[PDB]
Design a protein around this nucleic acid. Structure first.
Ligand SMILES: [Mg+2]
Ligand SMILES: [Mg+2]
Ligand SMILES: [Mg+2]
Ligand SMILES: [Mg+2]
Ligand SMILES: [Mg+2]
Ligand SMILES: [Mg+2]
Ligand SMILES: [Mg+2]
Ligand SMILES: [Mg+2]
Ligand SMILES: [Mg+2]
Ligand SMILES: [Mg+2]
Ligand SMILES: [Mg+2]
Ligand SMILES: [Mg+2]
Ligand SMILES: [Mg+2]
Ligand SMILES: [Mg+2]
Ligand SMILES: [Mg+2]
Ligand SMILES: [Mg+2]
Ligand SMILES: [Mg+2]
Ligand SMILES: [Mg+2]
Ligand SMILES: [Mg+2]
Ligand SMILES: [Mg+2]
Ligand SMILES: [Mg+2]
Ligand SMILES: [Mg+2]
Ligand SMILES: [Mg+2]
Ligand SMILES: [Mg+2]
Ligand SMILES: [Mg+2]
Ligand SMILES: [Mg+2]
Ligand SMILES: [Mg+2]
Ligand SMILES: [Mg+2]
Ligand SMILES: [Mg+2]
Ligand SMILES: [Mg+2]
Lengths: 124, 95, 117, 50, 78
RNA sequence: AGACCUGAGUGUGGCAGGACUACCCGCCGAACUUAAGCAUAUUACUCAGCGGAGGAAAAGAAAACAACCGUGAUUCUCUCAGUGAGCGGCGAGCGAAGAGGGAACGAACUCGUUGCCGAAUCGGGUCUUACAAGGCCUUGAGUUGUGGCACAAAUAUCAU
RNA sequence: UAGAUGUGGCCUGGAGGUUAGGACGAAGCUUAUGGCGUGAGCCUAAGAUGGACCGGCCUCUAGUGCAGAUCUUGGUUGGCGUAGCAAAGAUCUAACGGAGACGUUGGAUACUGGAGCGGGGAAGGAUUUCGUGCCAACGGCACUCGUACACGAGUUGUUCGGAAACUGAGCACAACGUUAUAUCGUUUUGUUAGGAAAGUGAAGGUGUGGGCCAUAACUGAAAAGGGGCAACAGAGAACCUGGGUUAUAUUCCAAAAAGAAAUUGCAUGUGG
RNA sequence: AACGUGUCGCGAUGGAUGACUUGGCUUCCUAUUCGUUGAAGAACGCAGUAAAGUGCGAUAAGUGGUAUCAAUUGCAGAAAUUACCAAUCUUUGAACGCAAACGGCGCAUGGGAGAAGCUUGUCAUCCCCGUGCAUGCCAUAUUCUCAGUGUCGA
């Protein structure tokens, strides 16, 4: 019938792009049919054949986003990745203060955490 | 790059020519003339309807007249070089 | 409340509309599996317990699950032009007499039965 | 009359299509509330001006 | 006179379509939208018409990215 | 024929604008109305207007109150109090504060100065399991002072 | 009368109590249904009404009683089949269609009268075009017709208009200034306390028998006066006939292009 | 007589009333607050049959993941629907290459069509696709370039 994704992940880019161009042509002529006759059997294959192009462009994008992520998410020098792949999070969660600060303290403020820590005393 | 999304050779040629047209005038121009009628996408190009024809229907196109219908849909008349009979494509394309 | 229940009822998604359409098992199919009631499935033979078609056994043709009714295969009705149509008995007016197997139904049926046992 | 921008043309085309009747497969739907289109424009009555 | 006769002299257009507000209040001669002040970066917004503020707030439209980002930030992500 | 100073140019790395505004913060700011008129006043330090943030904002750690047997950041609440305060064509009207009972509260802190230090700092690298509370190379900022430490004629500071 | 007051006093919505009805028919609704209370009102009956809620009593409660506000909203009505449908072109006939004054065709007499009931456009409208239906309500009469309703179609460009590509009245981004504040002001008869730009020319780089020859890089040659809009009547602008759509044509026509041109870009090559 | 009354029965119009109420309002509460990584807004789109709306964006009435079980339903069609939680996300808009009643125009920069020449392929203009290119500000550049009758010195 159509492309089943559980068996479609294992395919490759060059094997997908020939898988793709064939569902396009198949839908290309299903929109020829949709013009002239009704032919619900000749027709009616659109909504499965049009959501199979969807789950091929999906896996295509699901992959070449990872290949361009296992290439940019690297310890490489000056590690500036395109902002479309950088962990997206709201404009202010991106500016606010990371974990490595907002917990950072001077000298003469570390040293009281040691001299005079907070205790777990109990009252009788 | 500012993107990752894949592209191909297909989507560049199947988005332009979307479906042919069958009317009293769109039929009268396949037989009498050698034109075809495709409802191309609106933001296409007369030079890229020719390329798309040749990429989809391996026929030459000489004159590609277009018009954005009063539906927002861009029609396209396409002379087939007088060497590819149009009545042999509508029967192939299944018009 | 009154207002929020009659909304979560009529505004219930499809997979919610199937547990709100469960029918009681027969007197001798419950202790067969030791549970109380099941959601009606297509092709599960039943018997009407209330209505103009009461005590009429049939096989559930469908679960027309937005009219809030199930369609029984022997409960039909005639239109004006002879063409026979199917009336929809609300599942609670029905009593299941047959089930349809599944490795997800005689597994949840003993998830409900592991409550008893 | 003959000059309309393409953008102004795209907006009257989106109105020529919205001016079709409710198809008679809609009013047999289970619980619809639609009997008429009740947004049909007539070119004489009311104008769009866009 | 100044009634049905002068209504005949109604040839021009004062306003055309606003590219930002999507309505017909883009004053042609001095090119500014009469309803969103386009091309001013800030849309016009006056508390003396709260009723018209309400016709123009968020949620009055599609609200694409927010119906999504308000879901991500309400599920421990961002 | 070069440094420094003051400025440029683009290359990189970023940011700002916009929306929302109930609450909140700053500025601006009326008038109708009330005064049986009205100009002070009142409305009102309000509406509108400009601007700006947050999930709260603001305030906040005494150049405070008190005059007591003293209290002890801010905020909020009841209350003081529609006040034997007071302001006011002393008219209409307006009008708080300390104290007190509470909520909350392990609430305090760090710069500059001062003295002792004087680049121990910062940033670009790099090395390490990303370790940047560190390693070790760096004129690249920085001595026109980054950073460290001490808190009083009374303590104990200061180094192994 | 204004007013005051009382009522084991009347009534509507709801609450807390109590008593109680209801598919063997509740609320509602109807009234020549009586009765009974001075009255507000209550109760009954009978509905060829209604179909599912609700009465009494004690407290509580309030968005609680309407004839009258040029009340508000909805609906109806009189006048009333009445005023009127009177400015601007007079339809007359055949036979034909049609379910039938209607339409179509023919003939007739006319009207517009070339500042038109003409043919084309701008502004504006945007499917009103076209065809085939249709004729419910809309076309103030009617309709077999319609600018109505339905379905289907319909707008073709190297050259026409526009833009790309001019400047005008003028606008005002930047900068700069001012402003609590700008969304303010300056701004082509040339900006800015004011450092506002690859158009060219070049040495060097490069295939290869160190130069024949060639693209290219990346420099950087003088050169003042930032950009940018604003004209479908100014400027500018490379196409003309012939003809085969139900509706498009200086737009379409395919190869004895129906033809004939002009023209821009890049190219190969005959002329020096 | 008729008309006009007038009472009654039955009808019509009318849409009150009652009954219902997936709506409103009010009160309270538990958690976390959009955008240059292109928001809000609007524009146009997308369904086998869809005008509006809802949903979505040329992966378009949804694709993916999990978790659920057999429907969806006007009727086709089909061995999925529903719910939730990585993508896709058109034209715009703070909108930011310039402009703008232009779906217009560039400058770089790749790559990809199409071809005439030409050597079976190779890049001529032509034409798509994509990125980058706004201003201001901050940081910064192994000694990336500069200006100054500012300071000084070789
Ligand atoms: Mg203008
Ligand atoms: Mg602007
Ligand atoms: Mg604003
Ligand atoms: Mg200085
Ligand atoms: Mg310098
Ligand atoms: Mg930059
Ligand atoms: Mg700005
Ligand atoms: Mg802002
Ligand atoms: Mg007064
Ligand atoms: Mg005041
Ligand atoms: Mg205000
Ligand atoms: Mg704070
Ligand atoms: Mg008091
Ligand atoms: Mg005051
Ligand atoms: Mg106290
Ligand atoms: Mg210091
Ligand atoms: Mg009430
Ligand atoms: Mg009242
Ligand atoms: Mg009344
Ligand atoms: Mg009256
Ligand atoms: Mg019509
Ligand atoms: Mg300005
Ligand atoms: Mg009612
Ligand atoms: Mg906010
Ligand atoms: Mg976008
Ligand atoms: Mg929509
Ligand atoms: Mg702009
Ligand atoms: Mg930096
Ligand atoms: Mg230098
Ligand atoms: Mg000098």
């Amino acid at each position: 019938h159509h492309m089943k994704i559980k068996d479609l992940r294992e395919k490759s880019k060059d094997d997908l792009l020939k898988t793709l161009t064939e569902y396009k042509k198949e839908l290309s002529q299903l929109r020829v049919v949709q013009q002239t006759g009704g032919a619900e059997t000749r027709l009616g294959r659109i909504r499965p054949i049009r959501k199979s192009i969807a789950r091929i462009l999906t896996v295509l994008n699901q992959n070449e986003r990872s290949n361009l992520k296992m290439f940019y998410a690297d310890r490489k020098l000056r590690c500036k990745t395109p902002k479309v792949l950088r962990a997206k999070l709201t404009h202010r969660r991106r500016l606010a203060l990371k974990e490595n600060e907002k917990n950072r303290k001077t000298s003469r403020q570390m040293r009281q955490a040691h001299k005079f820590p907070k205790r777990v005393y109990a009252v009788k | 790059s500012n993107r990752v999304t894949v592209e191909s050779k297909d989507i560049a040629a199947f988005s332009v020519i979307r479906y042919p047209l069958t009317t009293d005038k769109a039929m009268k121009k396949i037989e009498e003339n050698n034109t075809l009628t495709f409802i191309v996408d609106s933001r296409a190009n007369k030079t890229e309807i020719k390329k798309a024809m040749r990429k989809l229907y391996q026929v030459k196109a000489v004159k590609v007249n277009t018009l954005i219908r009063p539906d927002g849909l861009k029609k396209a008349y396409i002379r087939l070089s007088a060497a590819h009979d149009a009545l042999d494509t509508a029967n192939k394309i299944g018009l | 409340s009154r207002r929020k229940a009659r909304r979560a009822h009529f505004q219930a998604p499809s997979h919610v509309r199937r547990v709100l359409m469960s029918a009681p098992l027969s007197k001798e199919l419950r202790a067969k599996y030791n549970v109380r009631a099941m959601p009606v499935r297509k092709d599960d033979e039943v018997i009407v317990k209330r209505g103009t078609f009461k005590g009429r056994e049939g096989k559930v043709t469908a679960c027309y699950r937005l009219k809030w009714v199930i369609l029984i295969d022997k409960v039909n009705r005639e239109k004006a032009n002879g063409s026979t149509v199917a009336v929809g008995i609300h599942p609670s007016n029905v009593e299941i007499t047959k089930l349809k197997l599944t490795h997800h139904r005689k597994s949840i049926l003993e998830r409900k039965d592991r409550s008893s046992k | 009359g003959r000059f309309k921008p393409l953008a102004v043309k795209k907006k009257y085309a989106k109105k020529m299509n919205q001016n079709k009747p409710v198809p008679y497969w809609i009013r047999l739907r289970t619980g619809n509330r639609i009997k008429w289109n009740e947004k049909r424009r007539h070119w004489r009555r009311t104008k769009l001006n866009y | 006179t100044k009634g049905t006769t002068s209504m005949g002299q109604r040839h021009g257009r004062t306003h055309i379509l606003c590219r930002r507000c999507g309505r017909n209040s883009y004053h042609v001669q001095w090119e500014r939208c009469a309803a969103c002040a386009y091309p001013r970066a800030s849309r016009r917004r006056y508390n003396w018409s709260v009723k018209a503020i309400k016709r123009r707030r968020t949620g009055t439209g599609r609200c694409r990215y927010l119906k999504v980002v308000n879901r991500r930030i309400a599920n421990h992500f961002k």
